[PDB]
Symmetry: C3
């Protein structure tokens, strides 16, 4: 039944899903070590650290392609759309926001939707790298991977933003789960655009997104 994947390929991420990626990235940034004191004593650094979690893919993909990073800041609808989620995650009255989204089902849904945004980020970087370089495979892998897990690769300098400098925890030394999954996805969809992978783009899209959401849901259910 390939008629369902065609329906899945018509999804738009502007209203609902972008807020889900921003919310999962901002909450996951808050749950990190010493992130509450940053927002309590330096809202600027915590806000910028949140933006590195939300728009790290576009930032790294722009720096790697010699594209202006401030171009990501031009979309005031997305920047404000993430900054509101930041201010509600940290400075909501009685912390009613976080306590609402820390609930297990809501957290599962939000995270699972961020996993969906990751896909269109990977393909966006692959097709964009194709717009800059025709049949260059490594470029498409690098930019699609850069949009898939951008915040995870700038995680060292992002740590440097909040104030923690860990020169030992490099992403290449020990590849984390989301970064390595974004590598596998970038390679796969790069083989898809190059037609080296015998499957249509929509079906590979759907099966990859499902294989990601199922894994993260299993991780969050087995962690609690």
């Amino acid at each position: 039944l390939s008629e369902v994947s065609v329906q899945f390929s018509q999804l738009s991420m502007f209203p609902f899903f972008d807020m889900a990626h921003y919310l999962a990235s901002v909450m996951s940034a808050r749950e990190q070590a010493g992130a509450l004191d940053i927002a309590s004593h330096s809202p600027m650094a915590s806000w910028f650290s949140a933006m590195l979690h939300c728009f790290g893919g576009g930032i790294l993909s722009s720096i790697l392609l010699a594209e202006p990073p401030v171009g990501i800041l031009a979309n005031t609808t997305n920047i404000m759309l993430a900054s509101a989620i930041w201010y509600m995650v940290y400075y909501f009255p009685y912390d009613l926001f976080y306590n609402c989204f820390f609930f297990l089902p809501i957290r599962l849904i939000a995270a699972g939707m961020k996993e969906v945004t990751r896909t269109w980020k990977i393909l966006s970087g692959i097709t964009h790298a194709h717009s800059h370089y025709k049949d260059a495979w490594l470029v498409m892998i690098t930019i699609g991977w850069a949009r898939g897990a951008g915040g995870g690769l700038i995680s060292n300098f992002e740590q440097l933003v909040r104030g923690v400098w860990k020169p030992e925890s490099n992403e290449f030394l020990k590849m984390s789960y989301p970064v390595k999954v974004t590598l596998i996805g970038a390679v796969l969809f790069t083989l898809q655009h190059g037609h080296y992978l015998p499957i249509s783009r929509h079906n590979l899209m759907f099966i990859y997104t499902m294989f990601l959401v199922s894994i993260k849901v299993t991780m969050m259910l087995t962690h609690s």
Copy 2:
């Protein structure tokens, strides 16, 4: 009497004022902790650290706009115009140069003129960001702010140049005086170009520059 602000708006900064910004930035860089030993044992690193103080605004504004930083190095008149001030600040015979410019009135004048260069740097970044992005407010704030206090934002990596690595003293954690003032100015003049601020550009220019020079003069008089 708005006829005086029109006369103030016709100022040119190529001869006198650029040397004032370079001199205040180089002297303020020398007065930092452990900067004399750098120039005494490694003139290259002290020179580059001085260039990060002088041309940090153009460097950061160029990196943020995907513009070549080496483009700032093309203007050999400005680069030499600052390098001469560096070599005279550090390696002048009997230190007759620094001891002359460390005098309170001369230091007040030079610093106060650097405060004037900061304004045209902010507006240069705002109008330049307008040339790259029409009515994008955050871009104009970011580039005007990037030219206002560029050396203050690269101050971490600039510290890394001389040899001191302080991951705890981030500019976003504790915003210093010049950086936060450049933020306020970038926001104000950005509202001016967008015509959200009910005042002409020249008058806002003059009152902002005066409000800056008066504050720094008061700081230098109350510090000694």
Copy 3:
């Protein structure tokens, strides 16, 4: 006998010499402190650290010229041509590869050929900077120098890649031999393109390359 330098100027570096630069840079990267454990426990970080040794000149010259660094990754023939040398330097059976190229004559030849690649990298950066900026001397010096010893200038962040963070060993504080030699060469050939240096390009090319190869050969013979 200027007829021999004309024959030397017709050299092509695509097959033999590029592999020599990649091999000397990868081997010299392995001989660094704690580089074997990186390749034994994290092949990704050791591979990227090797690419920073091989393509550091193009990377830094691309970042300084606002050119996409991923553009260096487009040439899959060169990237694979270096990655094969990396995998053979580290993971060859019985370490038969390294033990073969660590032999004194073979090491002398490979290093001496890397010294030859350095020249065409310097001139490539100088003529490229001329394509971006006509008669800007400092730009040509900066880009030619950036291609001459690129890995030596990113050596701090390259150290940060493997996991060692040394904020005290800056290249400007103590200029190493290859970096300072690349500075002298960039200045000389920049004076050549500007015709301030009374010598033809080919003769200066040959005498500079010889003056480099002789020095490195003398160093490797006096070190063992």
